[PDB]
């Protein structure tokens, strides 16, 4: 009824990482460690790093899913709003209803869960390229947090799960997301509110 959001490194020491993009007015995606919150513009690239301490088996996958953060909305499926689900901006793979897309991975699979109706996007887990220390997935969020009839100003969390080939849990991490016009300014405002 509600997916777990408990952080779980598991046997492979799985966790996320984020770039340090700053808070200039021009920034399109920026992560706040103090808030555990990603701020991004609509349909812009959000790089999310995957870190492990040891190599998981072939066939391991990485799934992303959004849920509402507030308990009174947690059972509602997070989906694109009535406008954006009809705006014909598909990449030829993501269903138009899905909030979260993976950019530039032809092996991405999009699931409409037959029992919970929740949306998710899953890719094969891959090792870092030679010369790199981690692997990065590029996500896009396809509605604003404010979209009426959709998220409608309700905060969401993205849950990233490391899964075996059957879909069993190997690791879990999560972060709040705000999709907004000015992520740099909103990160500064919310960090100031937190300090106050
Ligand atoms: C989570 C992404 N990922 C990593 C992230 C950080 C580091 C540490 N670098 C210093 C190593 C790996 C790593 C090693 C192997 C694999 C895989 C191998 C196979 C066969 C499938 S995935 C994935 C990996
Ligand atoms: Zn929308």
Q: Residue 11: which residues within 8 A CB-CB, separation 6 or more?
A: 54, 170
Q: How far is residue 159's CA from residue 118's CA, in Å, rounded to a whole number?
A: 12
Ligand 1, atom 9, lies closest to the CA of 133
The CA distances from residue 175 to 5, 38, 129, 146, in Å, are 9, 7, 25, 18
Q: In what order do the strands lie in the sheet with 29-32?
A: 29-32, 37-40, 169-179, 156-163, 61-68, 119-124, 109-112
Domains of the chain, residue spans = 1-196
Of 144, 138, 139, nearest to 183 (Cα)?
Answer: 144
By most ligand atoms within 8 Å of CB, the mutation choice from 52, 53, 136 for ligand 1 is 52
Side-chain half-sphere CA neighbours of 76 within 13 A: 16
Residue 37 pairs in a beta bridge with 32, 176
Contact 123, 137 (CB under 8 A): yes
Resolution (A): 1.3
Contact 190, 32 (CB under 8 A): yes
Three-state secondary structure readout of the chain: CCCCCCCECCCCCCEEECCCCCCCCCCCEEEECCCCEEEECCCCCEEEEEECCCCCCCCCEEEEEEEECCHHHCCCCCCCCCCHHHCCCCCCCCCCCCCEEECCCCCCEEEECCCCCCEEEEEECCCCCCCCCCEEEEEEECCCCCCCCCCCCCCEEEEEEEECCCCCEEEEEEEEEEECCCHHHHHHHHHHHHHC
Contact 141, 100 (CB under 8 A): yes
Q: How far is residue 117's CA from residue 137's CA, in Å, rounded to a whole number?
A: 24
Q: Read off φ and ψ for residue 117, nearest 5 degrees.
A: 65, 10
**Which numbered atom of ligand 1 lies nearest the CA of 162?**
1
Of 46, 167, 73, nearest to 111 (Cα)?
Answer: 167
Instruction: Please name the method used to determine this structure.
Output: X-ray
Task: Just give the CATH number of 1-196.
Answer: 2.60.40.720
Of 71, 103, 76, 73, nearest to 89 (Cα)?
Answer: 103
Q: How far is residue 3's CA from residue 23's CA, in Å, rounded to a whole number?
A: 31
Burial class (CB within 10 angstroms; exposed 0-12, middle 13-18, buried 19+) of 191 = middle
For ligand 1, is residue 136 a contact (CB within 6 Å)?
no
């Amino acid at each position: 009824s509600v997916p777990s959001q408990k952080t779980y490194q598991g046997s492979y020491g799985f966790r996320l990482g984020f770039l340090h993009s700053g808070t200039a007015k021009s920034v399109t995606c920026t992560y706040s460690p103090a808030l555990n919150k990603l701020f991004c513009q609509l349909a812009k690239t959000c790089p999310v790093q995957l870190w492990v301490d040891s190599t998981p088996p072939p066939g391991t996958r990485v799934r992303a899913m959004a849920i509402y953060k507030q308990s009174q909305h947690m059972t509602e499926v997070v989906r694109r709003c009535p406008h954006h689900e009809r705006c014909s901006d598909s990449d030829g793979l993501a269903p138009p209803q899905h909030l979260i897309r993976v950019e530039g991975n032809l092996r991405a699979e999009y699931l409409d869960d037959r029992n919970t109706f929740r949306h998710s996007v899953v890719v094969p887990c891959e090792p870092p390229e030679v010369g790199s220390d981690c692997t990065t997935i590029h996500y896009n969020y396809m509605c604003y947090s404010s979209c009426m009839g959709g998220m409608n100003r309700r905060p969401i969390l993205t849950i990233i799960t490391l899964e075996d080939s059957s879909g069993n849990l190997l690791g879990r991490d999560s972060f709040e997301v705000r999709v907004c016009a000015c992520p740099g300014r909103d990160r500064r405002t919310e960090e100031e509110n937190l300090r106050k």
